[PDB]
Amino acid sequence: TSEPCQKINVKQIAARLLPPLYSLVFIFGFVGNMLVILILINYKRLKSMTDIYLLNLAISDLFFLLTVPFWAHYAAAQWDFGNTMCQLLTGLYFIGFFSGIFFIILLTIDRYLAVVHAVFALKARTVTFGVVTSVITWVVAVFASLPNIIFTRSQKEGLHYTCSSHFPYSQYQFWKNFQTLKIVILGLVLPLLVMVICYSGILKTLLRMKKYTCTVCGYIYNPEDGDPDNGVNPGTDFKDIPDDWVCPLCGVGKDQFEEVEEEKKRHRDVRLIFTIMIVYFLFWAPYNIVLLLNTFQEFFGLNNCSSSNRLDQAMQVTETLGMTHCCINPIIYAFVGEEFRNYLLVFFQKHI
Partner 1 sequence: QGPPLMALQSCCFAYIARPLPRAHIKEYFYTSGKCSNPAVVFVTRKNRQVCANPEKKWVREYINSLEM
Ligand X SMILES: CCCCCCCC/C=C\CCCCCCCC(=O)OC[C@H](O)CO
Ligand Y SMILES: CCCCCCCC/C=C\CCCCCCCC(=O)O
| Binding residues vs partner 1 (CB under 8 A) | 1-7, 10-11, 14, 18, 71, 74-75, 86, 89-90, 93, 148, 151-152, 155-159, 162-167, 169, 172, 175-176, 179-180, 182-183, 291, 294-295, 297-298, 303-305, 308, 312-313, 315-316, 319, 323
Closest of 40, 82, 31, 121 to residue 327, by C-alpha: 31
The enclosing H or E element of 33 equals helix 8-42
Choosing among ligand Y, ligand X, Zn ion, none, which partner's interface includes residue 279 (Cβ < 5 to 8 Å by kind)?
ligand Y
Q: Where are the beta strands (DSSP E) in 97-225?
A: 152-157, 160-165, 212-214, 220-221
Measured from the Cβ of residue 238, the count of other Cβ atoms closer than 10 Å reads 18
Nearest to partner 1 of 296, 347 (CB atom): 296
Q: By CB under 6 A, which span of 37-45, 120-128, 301-309, 331-339 interacts with ligand Y?
A: 331-339
The CA distance from 49 to 130, in Å, is 5
Nearest to partner 1 of 136, 150 (CB atom): 150
Closest of 19, 153, 175 to residue 88, by C-alpha: 153
Q: What are the phi and psi torsion angles at 257 (to 5°)? A: -100, 145
Residues between 269 and 298 that touch ligand X (CB under 6 A): 281-282, 285-286, 289-290
Considering only 77, 122, 192, 331, the residue that binds ligand Y (CB under 6 A) is 331
217 in a labelled binding site: yes
Shortest Cβ distance from residue 143 to partner 1 (Å)? 17
Shortest Cβ distance from residue 62 to Zn ion (Å)? 49
Determine contact, residues 323/71, Cβ cutoff 8 Å: yes
Q: What are the phi and psi torsion angles at 265 (to 5°)? A: -65, -40
Residue 221 bridge partners (DSSP):
212
Residues between 37 and 96 that touch ligand X (CB under 6 A): 66, 69-70, 72-73, 76
Measured from the Cβ of residue 319, the count of other Cβ atoms closer than 10 Å reads 15
CA distances from 171 to 144, 147, 178, 277, 301 (A): 20, 15, 11, 35, 21
Q: By CB under 5 A, which span of 153-161, 168-176, 180-188, 249-257 interacts with Zn ion?
A: 249-257
Residues between 215 and 244 that touch ligand X (CB under 6 A): none
Nearest to ligand Y of 180, 275 (CB atom): 275
Residues between 269 and 308 that touch ligand Y (CB under 6 A): 275, 279
247 in a labelled binding site: yes
Residues between 191 and 220 that touch Zn ion (CB under 5 A): 214, 216-217, 219
Nearest to partner 1 of 46, 317 (CB atom): 317
The CA distance from 21 to 29, in Å, is 12
327 in a labelled binding site: no
The CA distance from 206 to 266, in Å, is 9
Choosing among ligand X, ligand Y, Zn ion, none, which partner's interface includes residue 249 (Cβ < 5 to 8 Å by kind)?
Zn ion
Determine contact, residues 33/58, Cβ cutoff 8 Å: yes
Closest of 233, 336, 225 to residue 277, by C-alpha: 336
Nearest to ligand X of 95, 214 (CB atom): 95
The CA distance from 56 to 279, in Å, is 18
Considering only 38, 150, 185, 250, the residue that binds Zn ion (CB under 5 A) is 250
Q: Quick check: helix, strand or coil at residue 86? A: helix
Q: Quick check: helix, strand or coil at residue 81? A: coil
Known binding residues for Fe cation are 214, 217, 247, 250
Interface with ligand X by CB under 6 A: which residues? 9-10, 13-14, 17-19, 23, 26-27, 66, 69-70, 72-73, 76, 173-174, 177-178, 181-182, 185, 281-282, 285-286, 289-290, 302, 307, 310-311, 313-314, 316-318, 320-321, 324
Interface with Zn ion by CB under 5 A: which residues? 214, 216-217, 219, 247, 249-250
Known binding residues are 214, 217, 247, 250
